[PDB]
Write a structure and sequence with these properties.
Length: 289
């Protein structure tokens, strides 16, 4: 229901894998009263990528939650393709950049507020049997100082009816340093691996996105920065097999790190639920206040 001729390009907001998001104004009355929106498109409209995109659009459309970015509509020109996803525009950018920019005014209670919101959004995904597969502060957006939203769903898959995991191995880079061990070894993605990645998100938050402290930097320094191409993955697997883990971030209390390390359990079935993670984060945040 969005006509392409009324979307006015303003700037690029972000560039994902096979996708990009643009800040546009939807101004059908041509009087500069229309609203600014976010428009997602494919960088190269492959038939396979187009079918993935259609599934992503339906997934997002099916989601309604304070902590999930709002679907608004779709757009297409010159027939059916050039397909574009229209979403609400969130003015503070990604939580990665936002935390980096205000580290001296965002204290731990605020971090835990964001954490809780992320947990509740992920739990909502779970009730729909959706596996996000790409949890990272770079894929959390900031609506305002009090609200974050899960921001991108390009890698989200729906669980089979009969199984609690989805086996997929895609070409491209994969965010290996947020991957559960069973995702690196068997391409198995589950709620439990989303929980692992959430552990990494919590690490990210408490590092305040410091340069040398990113999961890639830390993990490369634990395996050796020389490590060569695909060998990287292999060593990562071995490192995680021997319970090598990201270190406790500077200033991070013991209980928060413990939440992280319980998320980083090699035994998929021993990782906590998102509801319990929310419960615990909320108890800590209420104790701090
Ligand atoms: N998530 C996220 C990260 C990132 C890219 C991930 C893959 C493609 C985009 N990205 C998303 C925005 C954005 N910014 C403001 N409003 C928005 N609405 C909807 C998105 C969006 C900016 N960069």
């Amino acid at each position: 229901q969005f006509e392409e001729r009324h979307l006015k390009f303003l700037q690029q907001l972000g560039k994902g894998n096979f996708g990009s998001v643009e800040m546009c104004r939807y101004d059908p009355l041509q009087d500069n009263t229309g609203e600014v929106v976010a428009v997602k498109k494919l960088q190269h409209s492959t038939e396979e990528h187009l079918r993935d995109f259609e599934r992503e659009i339906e997934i997002l459309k099916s989601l309604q939650h304070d902590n999930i970015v709002k679907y608004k509509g779709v757009c297409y020109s010159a027939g059916r393709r050039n397909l574009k996803l229209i979403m609400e525009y969130l003015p503070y950018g990604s939580l990665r950049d936002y935390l980096q920019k205000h580290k001296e005014r965002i204290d731990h209670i605020k971090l835990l507020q964001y954490t809780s919101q992320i947990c509740k959004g992920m739990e909502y995904l779970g009730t729909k049997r959706y596996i996000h597969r790409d949890l990272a502060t770079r894929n959390i957006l900031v609506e305002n100082e009090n609200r974050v939203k899960i921001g991108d769903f390009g890698l989200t898959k729906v669980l089979p009816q009969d199984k609690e995991y989805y086996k997929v191995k895609e070409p491209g880079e994969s965010p290996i340093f947020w991957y559960a061990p069973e995702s690196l070894t068997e391409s198995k993605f589950s709620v439990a691996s989303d929980v692992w990645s959430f552990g990494v998100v919590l690490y990210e938050l408490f590092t305040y996105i410091e340069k040398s402290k990113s999961p890639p930097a830390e993990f490369m320094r634990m395996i050796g920065n020389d490590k060569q191409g695909q060998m990287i993955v292999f060593h990562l697997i071995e490192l995680l097999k021997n319970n090598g883990r990201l270190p406790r971030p500077d200033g991070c209390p013991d209980e928060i790190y413990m939440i992280m390390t319980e998320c980083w359990n090699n035994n998929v079935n021993q990782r906590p639920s998102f509801r319990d993670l929310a419960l615990r984060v909320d108890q800590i945040r209420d104790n701090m206040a």
